[PDB]
Amino acid sequence: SEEVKNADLYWGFSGSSHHKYDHNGPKFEKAGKGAELTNIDAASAYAETFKKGVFPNNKREKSDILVFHNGEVKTETNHSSYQINWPGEVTMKLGYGDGLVIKDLNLMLKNGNMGELKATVGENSNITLFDVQEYSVSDNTITVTPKIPPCTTGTWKPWHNDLTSKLGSLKSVFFESYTCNNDDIAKKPLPLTVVLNG
């Protein structure tokens, strides 16, 4: 808190995704250089956003989340599009030590009804990290709501096929499969909270 001329990003991605499959799934680590791990309890405002999003039935006691700090925001009245890019760095350990590496977090919004997040994963660049359908504005706080509502068929994809494809992991079924239990829905991304600088 008490941030001056700096922006912050509070979102799941890590921990919430593996609230129950953390030990039996991907692990988050190397959160530094513009990124850090923060407990959901500490993030009161963010936690509020999480509640508004998917409904968690069974989540680990105080699931940890991924936070991208040291970001920059470029909002202007010239257009209804927002340019926000977090240089935070985070690395995901595919089961064994290390594995998946992601960085250069980027956020693009248009008319607040069409936008997407861009990032670099592995050897692939300019990939669709997230699909933003719409977002809202608040007091120095902007909340993003991607189009990832509770499953309603069988196979529920949490992340865009671009990010999933870039997994490079043979555990495709683990990341995505013909399942979407209530717990899975909770792990599914949806609540995005960001803080404008100034």
UniProtKB/TrEMBL annotation:
Source species, domain of life: Bacteria
Cysteine disulfide partners in this protein: C151-C180
Keywords linked to the UniProt accession: Membrane, Transmembrane, Transmembrane helix
Protein's recorded name: Membrane protein
